[PDB]
Amino acid sequence: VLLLDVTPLSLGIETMGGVMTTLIAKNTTIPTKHSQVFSTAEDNQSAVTIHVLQGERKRAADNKSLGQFNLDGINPAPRGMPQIEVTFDIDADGILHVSAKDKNSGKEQKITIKASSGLNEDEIQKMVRDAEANAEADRKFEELVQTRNQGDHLLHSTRKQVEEAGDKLPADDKTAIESALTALETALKGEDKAAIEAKMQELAQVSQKLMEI
């Protein structure tokens, strides 16, 4: 064949830290279908937002929003435990169906997105050019968010361990841990990945007795 229908830009969702995670790559022939299992960002999360995006940028905010829906009724559980199946299905008419199903509860929500939605030909070309021109910056942002997500999880897991230990943790140790947690919390708001990793290292240096507990 000399011609066929494609989806002209990557399609995906916003994930933890404001990144776009792709489900369907740009120039994939249609009809097409792809599913991926996701989970919760924090402990006791009973709802997730499925924010549908079109584009090639690593920052979710830089892509074209196609729509969004919430999936509620998730049984509150530790982060990473729920299995949320997200499915992207584009029919032969270019109509996009996006669904999210929580495997444990069976709860499901879906949205239909019209073929005319999204970016036009000129906006597509500009999206591709802008993604190429900002390739190093988008990769640096992606690396920052991955370090931020680990730091955020370290903040929660350490705070949980401190309350669990209580009296078992000596005063000198708890003091140092709390001081390192504040320094880590501050670094996480910044955009220097090495500064966050360094605060994570400093926290590990004062958490040795908390780890034995």
Partner: peptide
């Protein structure tokens, strides 16, 4: 391994 979703 699975990627994570926020609650908005």
């Amino acid at each position: 391994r699975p990627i994570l979703l926020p609650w908005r």
